[PDB]
Amino acid sequence: RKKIFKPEELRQALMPTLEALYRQDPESLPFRQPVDPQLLGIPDYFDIVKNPMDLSTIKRKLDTGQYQEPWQYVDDVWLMFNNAWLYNRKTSRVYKFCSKLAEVFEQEIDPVMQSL
Numbered sequence: 001r002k003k004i005f006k007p008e009e010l011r012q013a014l015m016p017t018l019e020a021l022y023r024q025d026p027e028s029l030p031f032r033q034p035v036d037p038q039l040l041g042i043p044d045y046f047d048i049v050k051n052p053m054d055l056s057t058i059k060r061k062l063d064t065g066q067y068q069e070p071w072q073y074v075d076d077v078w079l080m081f082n083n084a085w086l087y088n089r090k091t092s093r094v095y096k097f098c099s100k101l102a103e104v105f106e107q108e109i110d111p112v113m114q115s116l
C-alpha cells in the first residue's frame with residue numbers, strides 16, 4: 001500500500017528546510033540562482049558540472065509539484081552540494097559556504113523526514 005504525497009503536503013513539509021538554506025547569509029548567495037559561467041568567468045563550469053542545480057530551481061519544483069517523494073527533493077539538494085564540492089577548490093569561499101549549507105540542511109531535514 002505505497003504512500004502517496006500530495007504536492008501540497010510536500011511543499012508544506014519540505015519548503016521550510018529550503019528556506020533555512022536561503023536564510024544563510026553569506027553562505028547561500030552563490031546558490032540562490034543558476035550558476036552563470038560567463039558572468040562569473042568560469043567557462044569550464046559546464047565542462048565539469050553536467051547536472052546543475054540551485055535553490056531557485058528546487059523552489060520552483062516544489063511550487064509546481066514536480067517531486068512525487070521526499071527523497072527526490074533531498075537528492076536535488078545534495079546534487080547542488082555535490083556540484084559545488086566537485087567544481088570548487090577546498091579553500092574557496094563557495095566550497096566552504098557549501099559545507100556550511102550542508103550542515104544546516106542535515107540538521108533541518110532529519111526531523112522532517114521522520115515526520116514524513
Ligand SMILES: CN1Cc2cc(Br)ccc2NC1=O
Binds near residue numbers: 035042084087088
Ligand atoms: C554554486 N557556485 C557559485 C559560484 C560563485 C562564484 Br562568485 C564563483 C564560483 C562559483 N561556483 C559555484 O559552484
